[PDB]
Amino acid sequence: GSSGSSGEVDPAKCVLQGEDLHRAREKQTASFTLLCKDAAGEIMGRGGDNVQVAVVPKDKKDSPVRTMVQDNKDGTYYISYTPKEPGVYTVWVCIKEQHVQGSPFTVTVRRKH
């Protein structure tokens, strides 16, 4: 659609999509969309990128967190994670060995009712 990327995807230009991305619930499945933009900071509408997703509790380090990643190769990635214990966590989102904008970030998980 009358579009033309600069050359490749840029992590510093990439962004995250989703409401209350910094708020999760204990034993809950939180998913968000990862938009891929080029060096021009515009939609590239392509895939073939290396996305790295990993969540770790700010409390412990040897205790990882369940995560999921379903590559689409269309322009939007599908990431999902579910905390096992309440508290604070650190979501790691980087592409091509590079931390994207507003990332990594923190996540305050609450206790289930």
Swiss-Prot record:
Tissue specificity annotation: Expressed in skeletal muscle, brain, heart and pancreas.
Subcellular locations according to the entry: Cytoplasm; Nucleus
Residue spans of the Filamin repeats: 8-109
Domain of life: Eukaryota
Function: E3 ubiquitin-protein ligase that plays a role in the regulation of inflammatory response. Mechanistically, mediates the 'Lys-48'-linked polyubiquitination of TAB2, a regulatory protein of the kinase TAK1, leading to its degradation via the proteasomal pathway and inhibition of the TLR-mediated inflammatory immune response. May act as a transcriptional repressor in mitogen-activated protein kinase signaling pathway.
Family as reported in the entry's similarity comment: Belongs to the TRIM/RBCC family.
Protein name (database record): E3 ubiquitin-protein ligase TRIM45
Biological classification of the source: Eukaryota, Metazoa, Chordata, Craniata, Vertebrata
Gene: TRIM45
Full protein segment contained here: 396 to 501 of 580
